[PDB]
Design a protein around this ligand. Structure first.
Ligand code: HEM
Length: 139
């Protein structure tokens, strides 16, 4: 799991994400769809307000990163939505690149924050991928 210092740094970004989260995720999508245009098809026809939905999930993750059992239901819900749109492990570094770049552009929070969010993203990605692997096996 993440170190206490990484957790402390993640918690310190919660106010920034509450103020700027949707700006960050909208920029993430702009970078993702431009650099990796095949990802557009994963989201076509899905629900509205994707930047808001991701920003809320990131804020909740940062808030409960030290209490992840509180996110059991939310993480299960994400995994099921991912499986319905054929999200695969190979996609996760694409969103990571674009999300960390958006965080740097919009918040310019320094290398300590960006390293912490890289670790936090990777932890949640591995969690989701593992759950999704199981769901991909389920009738
Ligand atoms: C740690 C990384 C990620 C997080 C925190 C995350 C978060 C979310 C959330 C909160 C939802 C909406 C769940 C719901 O309300 O039902 C979602 C759905 C979705 N995500 Fe992710 N996601 C991640 C990685 C990815 C990646 C790498 C891709 C593909 C490049 C992706 C593509 C999608 C798609 C296509 C949907 C379905 C949208 C919909 O049904 O409205 N996600 N994800």
């Amino acid at each position: 799991m993440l170190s206490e210092e990484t957790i402390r740094v993640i918690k310190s970004t919660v106010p920034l994400l509450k103020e700027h989260g949707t700006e960050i995720t909208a920029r993430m999508f702009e970078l993702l769809f431009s650099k990796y245009p095949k990802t557009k098809e994963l989201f076509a026809g899905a629900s509205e307000e994707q930047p808001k939905k991701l920003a809320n999930a990131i804020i909740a993750y940062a808030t409960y990163i030290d209490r992840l059992e509180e996110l059991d239901n939310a993480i299960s819900t994400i995994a099921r939505s991912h499986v319905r749109r054929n999200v695969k492990p190979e996609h996760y570094p694409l969103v990571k690149e674009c999300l960390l770049q958006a965080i740097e552009e919009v918040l310019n929070p320094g290398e300590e924050v960006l390293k912490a969010w890289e670790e936090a993203y990777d932890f949640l990605a591995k969690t989701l991928i593992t759950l999704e692997k199981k769901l991909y096996s389920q009738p």
